[model samples]
Target: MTKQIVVAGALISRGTLLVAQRDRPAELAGLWELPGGKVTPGESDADALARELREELGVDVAVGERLGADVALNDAMTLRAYRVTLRSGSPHPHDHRALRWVGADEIDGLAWVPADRAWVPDLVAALSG
Candidate 1:
């Protein structure tokens, strides 16, 4: 079975999260998601996130606590999320179509990646708490 690793990211600032829309590839362009990518063997998830964000968005980020273990799909891949601190850097869309800072109330209205949309409510509720 072929397996792929998925990384979910969280950039919370003053209780709002940063989400981006992919605009390049037809397959994923316009889908909104947290800034992250697949992990290479030698690198950690947090490190991958940091690298991807910098290369793709041209910014510096301080990756913080990882949520927990990966959520697995039978023989397909594993997905994991981390709570990150956007310590510095101006968010400019380099690979994505656009970027936005959103609150819990506006999360639903924004276009989100199919896999990621499910987590919006959970994220909002967590922030509200």
Candidate 2:
């Protein structure tokens, strides 16, 4: 377990949510996840989301409300989700193998990372309305 706060972005557009496919870390490769990274020391969750998106998606986003509950990634790490709207720049897979847009009905179709999977219910509800 690591002492880290990992935040994920739930970027949605046209009722479709964006998810990225991992390329490395054998265990996580081929699994889908929201675009975000660890929150650095002294960095607010919103700021971390912005910075992480820039690093991973190469896009600027307007972070909005929290999408779901904080998920325990282990004994020392936790994962959180935030609603996001693309502010500019088309998302380029900088750190992921691929990207896919899924609507509410398709949320359960992908093999999501375990931590992100916990938000499926909330994501589905969000996409519904």
Candidate 3:
């Protein structure tokens, strides 16, 4: 099993990507990002995405394709993004500071978490198409 993998969901609805804002961790606080969390060992990436999205956004999601280049967070940790579908429930900020729907044009301009910035092009394409 891989170690320190993280799963984030680019939850698309109404032709936009769902993004969340942070409220803590000083440096990352106030930056918007694709919502997800670290994957516990033994959990599949999809399962981790599904679980994190459920807990963080209060919505159910079916995880999809890997969206962009992998982000190496550390020697042992990597962050991955998946385009996901909302299967049930309307999403809200269950654990985040705020939530917003990001369209293609607005994506590149958001105050984003450093890691999530890597998914910009992928997010723009996914939001547009």
Candidate 4:
């Protein structure tokens, strides 16, 4: 497996979870995903999540506990999600097609990116809890 570390932020508020629509890289276009990107070398997962949220959503978040099992993107990369609280700022899509706050019951209805599908159960649990 390649040593690529990708991180995703599970930004939740008031029993709903935040998700963003992918707009670039044709294959992933129009699919919803947790906002995040590759973890830079020597950077902590928490830092990576914070950085990604700032860049993509223009929001500050408090990175909390992890949510689910690591989902493999390929032989070279793995994706993981962390529970996060929006510390400040409204989520504006700086790099996404759109953004939505999905309630627990709506989880299965969303058109999620394949790599992010594995964490649906965990996300549902978090939203319901």
Candidate 5:
């Protein structure tokens, strides 16, 4: 089993943020989220983000600063988002329903995963940068 940690990425380009649509568990389908996944015990947070992005988005990313404070997913699992810079290929949805680049103006309207919604203010700040 993987560690009780999920690391998500905030890949900002220009003034937009990359958001992936969920297509699983039925209910979360079509809702957007920052792309990332579980962290094995041995992998540093950065390593896990890079690995997951490669697996999930088919792109190489340079993981940067943390986006927001950690949010607990449950008793045993926690999730965090980070700033990432694309170092290689353009992002493609290998596992997600779709990929959308949303500028700050469009952010509030997208249906984001509940866990990811908390970072909206933080995302807005990053976008305004």
Candidate 6:
């Protein structure tokens, strides 16, 4: 099996959540998701989260308390979610196809990756009120 340590950074700004879109060649392309990537050998979750976000989203942030963890059983990957505070830089489609600032109620409207859509409920509840 392909062993991969996955991480996701949930970034909320003024009740709006930041989502990164994956470029072509990724499974869920054109779908929005929390920023993050696979944890390589010798890389901690925090380090991977920060590096991935900067490289993929072109935004600087600090990873904080984790939201939780879930497993993509079929994909054979463990999804780790964490809270991230935007430290600097504006969010854009750096490495992905695009990016968007989705507000609480509107988060569910966008085309979200199947795995990521599951977190919208919790994200909206926390970001909205």
Best by TM-score: 4
Question: Where is model 6 more than 4 Å wrong at Cα?
Answer: 1-3, 73-75
lDDT of candidate 4 over 36-100, digit per residue (tens): 99999989999998999999999999999988999888889989899999989999999999999
What overall lDDT goes with each candidate model?
A: 0.76, 0.92, 0.89, 0.93, 0.91, 0.80
- State in Å the error of residue 86, model 3: 0.3
Off by over 4 Å in 1: 1-3, 67-75
What local lDDT score does residue 47 receive in model 2, on the 0 to 100 scale? 99
TM-scores for all candidates: the values are: 0.82, 0.95, 0.94, 0.97, 0.95, 0.87
Better of 1 and 5 by lDDT: 5
Ranked candidates, highest TM-score first: 4, 2, 5, 3, 6, 1
lDDT of 1: 0.76
Best by lDDT: 4
Candidate 2 local lDDT, 1-129, one digit each (tens)? 457999999999888999999998999999999989889999999999999999998999999999999998889888999999999988999999999999988897779988898899999999988
Clashing pairs in 2: none
Model 5 lowest lDDT segment of ten: 1-10
Q: Alpha carbon lDDT of residue 16, candidate 3?
A: 87
Indicate whether candidate 3 or candidate 4 has the larger TM-score. Answer: 4
Q: Whose TM-score is higher: candidate 2's or candidate 4's?
A: 4
Residue runs of model 2 more than 4 Å from their true location after superposition: 1-3
lDDT (C-alpha) at residue 49 in model 4: 88
Evaluated against the true structure, the overall lDDT of model 5 is: 0.91
> What would the per-residue lDDT of candidate 6 be over residues 1-129, giving only the tens digit for each residue?
337878998898877888878776567887777878899999999999999989887789998887744647356677878889999988877787877778876877878887777777678776855
For candidate 2, the C-alpha RMSD (Å) to the true structure equals: 1.5
